[PDB]
Amino acid sequence: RGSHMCDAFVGTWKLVSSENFDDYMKEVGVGFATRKVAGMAKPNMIISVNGDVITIKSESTFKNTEISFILGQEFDEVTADDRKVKSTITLDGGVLVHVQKWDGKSTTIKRKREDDKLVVECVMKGVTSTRVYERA
Numbered sequence: 850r851g852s853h854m855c856d857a858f859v860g861t862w863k864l865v866s867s868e869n870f871d872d873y874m875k876e877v878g879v880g881f882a883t884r885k886v887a888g889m890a891k892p893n894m895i896i897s898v899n900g901d902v903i904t905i906k907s908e909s910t911f912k913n914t915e916i917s918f919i920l921g922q923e924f925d926e927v928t929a930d931d932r933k934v935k936s937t938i939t940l941d942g943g944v945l946v947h948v949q950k951w952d953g954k955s956t957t958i959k960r961k962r963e964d965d966k967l968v969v970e971c972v973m974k975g976v977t978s979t980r981v982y983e984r985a
């Protein structure tokens with residue numbers, strides 16, 4: 850297999866900035882204790898591609914999580930805050946667009962390359978949080 854555009858996401862990433870994440874978690878429905886502990890965390894994100902399968906791992910003092918998926922194909926995901934969601938991830942003009950559905954609710958997580966950073970935008974019902982990662 851040759852190179853793919855999504856190889857731009859591959860690597861080891863560390864959180865360097867976070868904005869409005871507590872308000873995003875509130876809108877998602879995360880409880881007080883989980884919001885406080887999750888808000889302290891500085892995750893490392895490890896992204897790899899093998900054939901059609903993309904794997905995103907998050908390692909932190911709060912939780913270690915991992916998803917593997919094929920673009921456009923729905924999968925089960927247990928989130929760091931212990932939601933059991935149905936997830937679909939697609940590539941839209943270079944942006945990984947991740948929709949999570951649960952309990953009649955929906956949230957969208959976008960992952961984009963900007964300069965040498967990986968920018969994550971989390972959106973729920975008018976509330977956005979921006980989390981910026983740099984290469985580890």
Ligand SMILES: CNc1ccc(Nc2ccccc2C(=O)O)c(-c2ccccc2)c1Cl
Binds near residue numbers: 907
């Ligand atoms: C609603 N709850 C919630 C939602 C998103 C989280 N994290 C991320 C998810 C996707 C892409 C990126 C991130 C990131 O963390 O940037 C976390 C979280 C996961 C691990 C540690 C801390 C928070 C939590 Cl709890």
